[PDB]
Amino acid sequence: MQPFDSGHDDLVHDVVYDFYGRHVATCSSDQHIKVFKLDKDTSNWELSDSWRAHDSSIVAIDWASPEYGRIIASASYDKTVKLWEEDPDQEECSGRRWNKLCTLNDSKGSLYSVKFAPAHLGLKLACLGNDGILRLYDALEPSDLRSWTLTSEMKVLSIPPANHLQSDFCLSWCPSRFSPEKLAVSALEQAIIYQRGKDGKLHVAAKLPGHKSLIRSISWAPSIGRWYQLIATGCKDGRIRIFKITEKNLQVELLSEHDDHNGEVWSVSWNLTGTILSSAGDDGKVRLWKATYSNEFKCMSVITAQQ
């Protein structure tokens, strides 16, 4: 294990595993995405490649599933998502193995997020920007990664994001296609669950209540152990709120709500087996939560690090 320096010269905005979790990509204000492949031997992330994937700061990076090959979408403040495919037989340690699939000039504002749809719901990506426009992109084919059509736009935030409305804003999908297609979107205090109608225009299907403060992360749980959903939110007041959404249109219920960071919970991140939530928040400590047989999540462990 042990401390390692990523070698980024500016700050790390994101850490994203592959869907198989064989790669970690980090993105920074130094215009690079650095992609590391997992050496199990040292249990460290060893530098595979580094390239400028935009001519500005990279603030959202996300992996698509290695089930169509490795695709990178990356969001920058230069107004474009740039799409990249990994070739092994292209050179590594040079940035010659990421061939640009496209440049999408379909984003009229500067991006702050781009996030892939799970394998199970089809290859789609959502955008959000600093013009406050939720963008729904559908690839025309799962094997044609070089075009993506804007299929829907929904004006989320009441006031656009500006130099003081600037916060973490997050895009998360619904991993189940045995649940109607949706994507929960957190912007400020409101988390609004959007659902695809049968008319091919997105509608508001639900609103998540009980958000007393800004949502700094929203993460939709894969429905595993049960076929219902759970969405966790990390909020600024040290609250982990796990609400359960049952499918009967959507019902809203609480599962549990508890607060233990007590400063601000910055990130919520569910595992892919949808049974362990790990949250971190202000105070520098990571709390690892596992369900009881009273059917509620409780803190099983506390890891303390640096600030």
User: In terms of Cα–Cα distance, which of 53, 42, 178, 39 is closest to 120?
Assistant: 178
> Given the complex with another protein, which of 26 and 76 has the nearer CB atom?
26
Q: List binders of another protein among 209-268 (CB under 8 A).
A: 222-227, 266-267
* Pair 72, 25: CB distance under 8 Å: yes
Interface residue with another protein, options 33, 35, 43, 233 (CB under 8 A): 43
Q: CB neighbours (10 Å) of residue 55?
A: 11
> Given the complex with another protein, which of 9 and 189 has the nearer CB atom?
9
- Residue 93 near another protein by CB under 8 A: no
Q: How far is the CB of 101 from another protein (least distance, A)?
A: 11
| Only segment of 68-76, 106-114, 133-141, 199-207 that touches another protein (CB under 8 A) | 68-76
Interface residue with another protein, options 158, 163, 249, 307 (CB under 8 A): 307
Number of residues that bind another protein (CB under 8 A): 80
Q: List binders of another protein among 151-180 (CB under 8 A).
A: 175-176, 178
Q: In the beta sheet, which residues pair with residue 75? A: 60, 81
User: In terms of Cα–Cα distance, which of 114, 163, 300, 281 is closest to 213?
Assistant: 281
- Residue 59 near another protein by CB under 8 A: no
> Given the complex with another protein, which of 17 and 51 has the nearer CB atom?
17
Q: Token digits for 114? A: 């781009």
For tokens 């303390």, the residue is 304
Q: In the beta sheet, which residues pair with residue 182? A: 195
Which backbone phi and psi does 173 adopt, to 5 degrees? Answer: -115, -170
- Residue 41 near another protein by CB under 8 A: no
The tally of CA atoms less than 13 A away on the side-chain side of residue 80 is 14
Q: List binders of another protein among 185-214 (CB under 8 A).
A: none
Distance CA 245, CA 278 (A): 20
Q: How far is the CB of 3 from another protein (least distance, A)?
A: 5
Q: List binders of another protein among 1-30 (CB under 8 A).
A: 1-13, 15-17, 19-22, 24, 26
> Given the complex with another protein, which of 85 and 125 has the nearer CB atom?
85
Interface residue with another protein, options 62, 85, 92, 181 (CB under 8 A): 85
DSSP classification of residue 221: P
Q: How far is the CB of 83 from another protein (least distance, A)?
A: 13
Q: How far is the CB of 246 from another protein (least distance, A)?
A: 14
Distance CA 246, CA 227 (A): 9
Distance CA 48, CA 222 (A): 30
- Kind plus residue range of the DSSP H or E element containing 38: strand 32-39
Interface residue with another protein, options 102, 119, 192, 250 (CB under 8 A): 119
- Name the amino acid, one letter, at 246: T
Distance CA 33, CA 28 (A): 7
> Given the complex with another protein, which of 149 and 292 has the nearer CB atom?
292
| Only segment of 133-141, 156-164, 184-192, 281-289 that touches another protein (CB under 8 A) | 281-289
Distance CA 173, CA 185 (A): 8
Q: List binders of another protein among 129-148 (CB under 8 A).
A: 142-143
